[PDB]
Amino acid sequence: MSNSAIPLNVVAVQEPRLELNNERTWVVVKGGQQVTYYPFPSTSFSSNQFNFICNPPSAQTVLDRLVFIQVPYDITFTANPSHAGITENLLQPGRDAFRAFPISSITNTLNATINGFPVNIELAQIIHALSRYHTPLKVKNGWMSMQPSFEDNYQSYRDADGANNNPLGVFTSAAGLSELPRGSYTMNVVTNTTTTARITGVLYEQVFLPPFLWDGEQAGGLANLTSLTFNWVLNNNLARIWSHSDITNDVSGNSTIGSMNISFQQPSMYLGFVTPRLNIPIPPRITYPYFKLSRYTTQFQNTLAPNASSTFKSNVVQLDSIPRKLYLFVKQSDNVIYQNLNNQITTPDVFLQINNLNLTWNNQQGILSGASSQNLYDFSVQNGYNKTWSEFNGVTQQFNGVSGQPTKVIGLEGGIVCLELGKDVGLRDDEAEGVIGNFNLQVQMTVTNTNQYVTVTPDMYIVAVYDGTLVISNTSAMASIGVASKEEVLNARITHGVSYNELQRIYG
């Protein structure tokens, strides 16, 4: 051991097949008696709102963190003339589904108030890019499975047919022990003929936003609150829930569906409340981790396609405090796909392919500026990305065997960079991962539309998550942001117990 250079320290370890001794301590697991579940049916449901005001039973009972709602719903489709006709059922075996996750992207915003100081998030634009980012297969087959859950991986729906991974097919045709497509999801079909379809069922969507958690891994739920209450609002259009394929819409048209309408019934939330036992007392006041994520967004006028490139920058913003990490992507814009609804039902979620990204932290200018688009995909996947290289940088050749038909190129749906803000952006001496303040940000990024048809005006999105303390003591909910002092950040002694990998484990 003390053979080489600077000598080391010796330790020995027993192989797994044999200890055979070590100190084996019997461990009685105990948690409070009486864990019970309630179904709080929403008071004051509407067509543009849902409001669930529910009160904790005792205020001495901890409230478990996973929460979800269920909405019974009803849609009627009908055929437009022309395109007409028309001779196939208005709903098609392989060309039709819910968008994922349905009752989510449809909702404009969600805000739950605890204790009650409100913590709210933006669910329409935030989520579709938040989904890719932290889930392993283990998770996407667990909790995440209650709502349609298969993300759009073709640049255009029309192309997909008929692949083995067409994002909206029947259950049969997803290989054993894997994530099914979104035409897997169960619901009654009361009618289905040409000129008319009409469907019914019930969809379970879990709530996102902290401190309610959509990871499987759990942590001590919020006690000792005195009243909590959720509040959705859905943006007007509501044709966004459904999905479709161009492959059937063909003509000078136009298409088969336009138009159709939805209807909800009594939704209800599902809360859960353990009780701790009279032996072990939980503290009068108690502190929780708390994250806020809020998106900043430019819109441009320039129109680029069907596969031509260009460059863009986004108006400066001044963060109050360093986000713990931020995401950046260029998605196809909102101003379109909110007109003449056929567009709403037949445009996938996917983002444009990135060529390079240079950004500026406070005053720096040109950060990362010389890192290859390949070299952007290295992190994450180190912050947990989860899509093969070919998916990022989305493009894929796939050629045809005859004389003479030119090979066909498909967009494979683009990428979204996430850069953890101290992990690989670097911060001036004596500046933590979240201290006030305040530093400009500006993202200058060149992009390319890889979707074969058609042109698209884009927008840029940048979603930054901040890390604040939140102390819920009944019945106040103070929430200090930028918790560490600038003097405390120098000479805060390092530890060798905690592993950094265990901190990136706690989402987030």
What backbone phi and psi angles, to 5 degrees, belong to 216? Answer: -80, -15
Cα separation, 348 vs 491, in Å, equals 50
In the bound complex, what is the minimum distance in angstroms from residue 69's beta carbon to a second copy?
19
In the bound complex, what is the minimum distance in angstroms from residue 230's beta carbon to a second copy?
19
In the bound complex, what is the minimum distance in angstroms from residue 441's beta carbon to a second copy?
10
Which of 14, 36, 43, 58 is close enough to bind a second copy by CB under 8 A? 58
Cα separation, 288 vs 468, in Å, equals 9
User: Would you count residue 36 as binding a second copy (CB under 8 A)?
Assistant: no
150-163 burial code (b ≥16 CB/10 A, e <16): bbbbbbbbbbbbee
Q: Which is nearer to a second copy, 254 or 275 (CB)?
A: 275
In the bound complex, what is the minimum distance in angstroms from residue 445's beta carbon to a second copy?
16
**Nearest by Cα to 392 from 405, 411, 408, 407:** 411
Q: Which is nearer to a second copy, 80 or 226 (CB)?
A: 226
Binding mask 439-458 for a second copy (x = CB under 8 A): xx------------------
Cα separation, 38 vs 66, in Å, equals 13
Q: Which is nearer to a second copy, 40 or 379 (CB)?
A: 40
CA 403 to chain centre: 45
User: Would you count residue 57 as binding a second copy (CB under 8 A)?
Assistant: yes
User: Would you count residue 59 as binding a second copy (CB under 8 A)?
Assistant: yes
User: Would you count residue 32 as binding a second copy (CB under 8 A)?
Assistant: no
Would you call 313 helix, strand, or coil by DSSP? coil
In the bound complex, what is the minimum distance in angstroms from residue 439's beta carbon to a second copy?
7
Q: Binders of a second copy: how many residues, by CB under 8 A? A: 7
Positions of E strands within 167-284: 188-193, 196-206, 228-234, 242-243, 268-273
CA distances from 313 to 310, 360, 372, 455 (A): 11, 11, 19, 20
User: Would you count residue 232 as binding a second copy (CB under 8 A)?
Assistant: no
User: Would you count residue 436 as binding a second copy (CB under 8 A)?
Assistant: no
Tokens standing for 59? 């205020």
Stretch that binds a second copy, among 73-81, 166-174, 213-221, 434-442 (CB under 8 A): 434-442
Q: Which is nearer to a second copy, 438 or 485 (CB)?
A: 438
In the bound complex, what is the minimum distance in angstroms from residue 63's beta carbon to a second copy?
14
Q: Which is nearer to a second copy, 377 or 439 (CB)?
A: 439
DSSP state of 353: E
SS (H, E, C) 98-139: ECCCHHHHCEEEEEEEECCEEEEECCCCCHHHHCCCCCCHHH
Q: Which is nearer to a second copy, 59 or 187 (CB)?
A: 59
What backbone phi and psi angles, to 5 degrees, belong to 95? Answer: -120, 55
User: Would you count residue 52 as binding a second copy (CB under 8 A)?
Assistant: no
User: Would you count residue 438 as binding a second copy (CB under 8 A)?
Assistant: yes
Q: Which is nearer to a second copy, 291 or 439 (CB)?
A: 439
Are 433 and 504 contacting, i.e. CB atoms less than 8 angstroms apart? no
In the bound complex, what is the minimum distance in angstroms from residue 223's beta carbon to a second copy?
14
- Per CB under 8 A, residues contacting a second copy are 55, 57-59, 438-440
